[PDB]
Amino acid sequence: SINSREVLAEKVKNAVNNQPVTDMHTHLFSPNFGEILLWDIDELLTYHYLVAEVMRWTDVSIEAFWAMSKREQADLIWEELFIKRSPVSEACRGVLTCLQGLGLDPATRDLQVYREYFAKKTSEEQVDTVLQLANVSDVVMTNDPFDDNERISWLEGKQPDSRFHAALRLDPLLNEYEQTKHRLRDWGYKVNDEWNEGSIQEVKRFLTDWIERMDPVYMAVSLPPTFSFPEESNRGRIIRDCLLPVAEKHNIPFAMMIGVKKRVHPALGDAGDFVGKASMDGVEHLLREYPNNKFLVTMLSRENQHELVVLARKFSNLMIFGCWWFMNNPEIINEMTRMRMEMLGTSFIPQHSDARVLEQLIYKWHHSKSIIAEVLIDKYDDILQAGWEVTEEEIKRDVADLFSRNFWRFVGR
Amino acid sequence: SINSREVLAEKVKNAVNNQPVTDMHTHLFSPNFGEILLWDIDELLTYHYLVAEVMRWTDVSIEAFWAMSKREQADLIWEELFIKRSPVSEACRGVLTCLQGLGLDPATRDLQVYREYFAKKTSEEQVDTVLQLANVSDVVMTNDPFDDNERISWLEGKQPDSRFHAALRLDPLLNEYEQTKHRLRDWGYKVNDEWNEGSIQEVKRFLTDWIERMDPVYMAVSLPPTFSFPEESNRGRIIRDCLLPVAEKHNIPFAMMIGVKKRVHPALGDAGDFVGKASMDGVEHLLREYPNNKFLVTMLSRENQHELVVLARKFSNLMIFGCWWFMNNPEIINEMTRMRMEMLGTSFIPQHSDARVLEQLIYKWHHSKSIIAEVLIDKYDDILQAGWEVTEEEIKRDVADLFSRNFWRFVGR
Amino acid sequence: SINSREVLAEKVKNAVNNQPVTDMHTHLFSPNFGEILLWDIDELLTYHYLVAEVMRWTDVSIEAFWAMSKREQADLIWEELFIKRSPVSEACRGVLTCLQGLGLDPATRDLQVYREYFAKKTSEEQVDTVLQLANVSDVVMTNDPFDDNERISWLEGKQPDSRFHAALRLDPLLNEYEQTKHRLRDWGYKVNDEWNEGSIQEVKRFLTDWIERMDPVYMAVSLPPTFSFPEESNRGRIIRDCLLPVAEKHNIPFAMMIGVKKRVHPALGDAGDFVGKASMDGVEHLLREYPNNKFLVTMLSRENQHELVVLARKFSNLMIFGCWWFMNNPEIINEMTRMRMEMLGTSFIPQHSDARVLEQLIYKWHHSKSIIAEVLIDKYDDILQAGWEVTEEEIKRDVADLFSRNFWRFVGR
Numbered sequence A, B, C: 001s002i003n004s005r006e007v008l009a010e011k012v013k014n015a016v017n018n019q020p021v022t023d024m025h026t027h028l029f030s031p032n033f034g035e036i037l038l039w040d041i042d043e044l045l046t047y048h049y050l051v052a053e054v055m056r057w058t059d060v061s062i063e064a065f066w067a068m069s070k071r072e073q074a075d076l077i078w079e080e081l082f083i084k085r086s087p088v089s090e091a092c093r094g095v096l097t098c099l100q101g102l103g104l105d106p107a108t109r110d111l112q113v114y115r116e117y118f119a120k121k122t123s124e125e126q127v128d129t130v131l132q133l134a135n136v137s138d139v140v141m142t143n144d145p146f147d148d149n150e151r152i153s154w155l156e157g158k159q160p161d162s163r164f165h166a167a168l169r170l171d172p173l174l175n176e177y178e179q180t181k182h183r184l185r186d187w188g189y190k191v192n193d194e195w196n197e198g199s200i201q202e203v204k205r206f207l208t209d210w211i212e213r214m215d216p217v218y219m220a221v222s223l224p225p226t227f228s229f230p231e232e233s234n235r236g237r238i239i240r241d242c243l244l245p246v247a248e249k250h251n252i253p254f255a256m257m258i259g260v261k262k263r264v265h266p267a268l269g270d271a272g273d274f275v276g277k278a279s280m281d282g283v284e285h286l287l288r289e290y291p292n293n294k295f296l297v298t299m300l301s302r303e304n305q306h307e308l309v310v311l312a313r314k315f316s317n318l319m320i321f322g323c324w325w326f327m328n329n330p331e332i333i334n335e336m337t338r339m340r341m342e343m344l345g346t347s348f349i350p351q352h353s354d355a356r357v358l359e360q361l362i363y364k365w366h367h368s369k370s371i372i373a374e375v376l377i378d379k380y381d382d383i384l385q386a387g388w389e390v391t392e393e394e395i396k397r398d399v400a401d402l403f404s405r406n407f408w409r410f411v412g413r
Ligand SMILES: O=C[C@H](O)[C@@H](O)[C@H](O)[C@H](O)C(=O)O
Pocket: A027, A142, A222, A257, A270, A324, A325, A354, A356
C-alpha cells in the first residue's frame, strides 16, 4: 500500500517520467525527409513564439529582423530576451530546459559553445538523442500535400521511420477551396465550377489518394473562431459530402483545432496569428449527427475550455486533446488538466508538444509532465483519503492511457 | 486519515495545544495560601532570571537594586532589558508571551497600561484566567516545611484547592542536617547527638507526619554536583535509613534535582546559583539497590543529559522529567527532548514550568509545547513514511502521556 | 516598527553585513611591523589547520613536509585536500571564501593565477583591500614581549596604525616562570629565588613597563584544562599578587583562553595542540573574589560552553567571547551562539577571527556573520510573534553591541 502522499508523489513522478510518450501533434518530420525537419539552438531561438516576444522589446524593425540571417536573428533574440531581461516567459524557459537536457550549461550563457554541440552531429543522431531524452516513442507529424517541398518527399516514395506517423492536414482544401480547387485540377482532379456529383467524387478521390499514400492516423484542420456547421460554404459542403463519408469508411478520426484568427498582423508571419472564442454549436452538431465518425478536438480560447470538457461528457465519439498554443502555459495547462480529469477521469489526452523544432520535445514534455504529475498526485491522494487503495501498477496503467494508449485506442491503431 | 507530514503537523499541533497540562514542579501556591502566590507584571519582571540578566547591563549596584521597591526594580529591568536592548533572551521573551496571552499588546510597550490590567483583578480571578489560558489542569507545588511562613500555613490548616498538589521539599533536612537537627528537636522530634535508633525513628516520624499533613505526590530535594550514594554522611544515612523506607511504605516517589551549586554569588540571592556536572554513580546505585522505590530525576548540567537518558533505559523505576533551569532554553529543550524520545519513546515527562510567578505558566508551556510539537511531528512522520498508520486518537493518547498521564501513573494516583 | 518576518530578516542581515567589525583576538600585526604579518594564498593554504588535515591524507612524512618550501607545501595541500577530495572541511571552505571575496574565481581551480594576484600588491595594499572586504575596522593583535623578533620592534619604536590594537600576551611568564624569570633578570627585573616582596614588585614593574609601551586593551594568557585558582604555584602567585592588582589599577581586563593541551604531537608544530575540559572552579573564584577586575573568557572544550554561559549569568565582571579554535566550526558556533543569546540576551561577544593570515578575515567573518544573523533573525522573530516590534535602529544598535560596542565598553576605551 501507499500510506503517504510523499511516497505517492514519488511513485507518480517516476511513472509519469518513465512512461514513453506518443506525441499526437507536432510539426516535426522523420529524419529521412530532409531539411524540412528543423533542429538546433538557432532554430530554437527563432521559434515564432520568441519572434513575437522579441518584437515587444527590440527596436529593430520586423522588416530588418527578417532581413538578417538565422544566426543573426538568434543573436538578437538571445540578447533581448535572455540577457537584457530575465528569460522568465514559458517559451524562453523552454529553450533553457532544452539546453540543460542536452547536457549543456545555461549558467555560462556561452551561445557559441552551445552552437558547437549541434554542428558536430547529424539529423539522424540528434533525433535519436532527443527522442531518448524526452522519452518520446511516437511522433505524429503534420503532413500537408499542398506544400510543394513536403509533397515532393511523398511523391518520391519516401516513408517515415516507425517512430513517425502521418496526419493529413487539409487547411488549404477546406479553408481556401476557391483558390485551391485550381491546384487539384492541375493534379488531375476534375473538380467543377459548381458543386455537383463530379466535384464531390474528385475531392473524395483526392482525400482517398493521400490516405493511401500517407496512411495517416487522422485528417486535420485548424478553424477560425467563427467556425460553423452545417454551413453553405465550400468548407461546410466539403466536410459534409467528402471528408466525413471518407473518414467513416476508413475509420479515421477528424482532428479539428478551433479558435485561430490567422494573420491579424501579417508582417509577423507565423507569429501573427490571434485567437477568439468559438461557438460549440458546430462541434455539437457534428458529434450528434455523425455518431459513426470520430473527432479529435482542441480549442484555442481559454473561454472555450470548460464547455469543451462538458461536451466530451456528452459524446463518446469526441476525444479532446492537449493545451494548444496560447493554452500551452503553466497556469492554463494546470486549470485545463484539472477540469478535464475532474469531469472525465482519465478518458482524455492531456497534452501534445506541437514542436516545430526537434529539441522542443525535451522542454514541452518536461514542463508538461511535471504539471500533469502534480494533478495526478492530488487526484490519487483524494481517493486514497476516501479509503481507496491505489496500486503502483494501476498508476502506471493510468499514466500509459494519458500519455499514449488513449490516442492509439481512439484512432484504432 | 493522516497520510502526510503536512496533515500530521496539523493534528499534532492541535492535540498538543488542546492537551490539559499537569505541571509537576512549580513554585506556585494554591491562591488560598495568600500572598505567597506571586503574580502580575511587576513580579514577572523581577523573576530572578531577569535579576541576573539586568545586572550584566545596569550600572545600578546589586545592593541598591534590593533596596528599591518592587515597581522600581521592575521599571529598571524593563528599561535595561527591553528598551535599551531588544528583549531577545528566553526569560525576556517569556514576559512578552505572557502579556500577549492576557490580551495585552507588547507592540505598545505601555507598561503603565499593562499594570492597570492586574490592579483591577483578584488572585482567585487571575488564577482562573491563567490556568485557562495556559490550559493547565494541575499544578504541583514545592512545599518547604522548614520555611517558617510556609510551615505555619500547613500547621494552621491551610489546604490547596483541587487544582494544586503538594510536594514535600526536604533540602534543609538532607543537605544541612547539622543545623536542621536542632530545629527538629525544637518541634518535638527527639533526634540525638549520634545517629542511633532514636534519631532514625524520629526523622522517620517527621517525614510521616508531614506526608499525612500534605498528602504529597512525592518528596523532593535539590542536590549538588558532588552528590554521591551510598555515602557515610548525614545525607547518605538519612536517605538510606529514613527517606527510602518511608517512601516505599507510602509508595511515594523520591524526586532528585541534581547539579545545583548553591550561592556562588551570595549577593544575588535566588539568582546566585551555579551548575556542575554530576557523577551518575549515586543515581545508578539508588535505582539498582532499591527496585521497590520510585525515582523522579532531572539534572542541571547539559553534559549529564545524554547519560541520564541511557540510565532510564536501564531502570524502569527511574522516570526522568523536565528541562530544568539552565536547561530550560530552546536550543537545549530541543536536543534533550529529541535524545529522550529517540531512546525512550514516550516513556518520560518532557517538561515542567518551575513557575515562580503565576503568569509564567503561559509562556513556559507555550514556548515548550511548540518545540515538543515539532519533535513529535518529526518522530511521527518518520514512522508514517515507514508505512505505519498513525491515528489522531493514538496521537492524543501519546500526547496525554507526555503532558499528564505519565506523571500520575508514576506517582500512583 | 517591523511587523513582517520577511522585512525583519532583510533588516537584520543588512545590519549584520554593514556593521564594521572589531576583531578582538587575532594573530595579525599592523603592516608596518614587517614580514611578521602573514598574507596570500600560500599562507592561507599552509595555515596549521590545513597542516593537520593534509597529514591525515598524504603519504608524505611530516618531516618531508617541513623540509619542502612554502610553495611546495601549498601545492601538496591544494592537491591533497582540494583536488583528491572535495574541500568540504571548514578550513578548506575558508580558503575558497577568501579567494572568491578577493574577486578570484575558485571555479577554474587555477592556483597559479590566484598566486599572481598577490604578487602584484604590497602588504599595506592588501590590508587595505582585506579590511574593506571583511568590513573590519579594528584588529586586536597578540603581542608577545618574550618573542625576540616582536620585542625588538616594540623597543625600536614601532607602533601599529590606528586600526591595529595591542594585547599583552603573557604565556611564558605565567606558565613557564621558572625558565622565564632568568630572562626577566637579563632585562633588569631582579626577581628573587623565592616569591617575596622583591619578586612581586619586579614582576609588577615588568607588566607596567609593557603596559605603558604597548598600551594594550587587555592582558592575555592561554591556559591548560588543569588550570586552577587559587593555586600555590608560580602562576597562582603571579596572577594573585601581580597581574590582578596591576590590571585593576590600569582598569585593564584579564583575558583567559582556557582548555588547550600544548604539544601533544610536537612534530606537527603549531598544529600539534590538543584540548581538554576544564573545571570552572578557578574562573568562579576569580570572578567572585576580584569584583573590581574585568575578565574576558573563551574556552576550548565543547563541554565547557554551557556552564561558562551560566557563569556569565552570575558575574557581570565576566565577558565571554568567541568560538575559539576547535569551537570555530558551524555546528558549534551555532549551538554556542544560541545558548548564549538565550541566557544572556546581547550581553556577550559572539566571535573573534583568530586570523593568523591576513585574508582569513574575509572567511572568518563571512562564515560567522551568516550564522549570527540566522540566530538573531530567529530570536527577533520569536518576540515578533509575541507581539513585540523592533525598529531598524534598535537592530543596528544590538548588532553594533555584539560586533564592536560590547568589547570597547568592557575594556573601557
Ligand atoms: O503552437 C503553435 C503552432 O506552431 C502554430 O503555428 C500552428 O499553426 C498550429 O498549431 C496549427 O497546427 O495550426
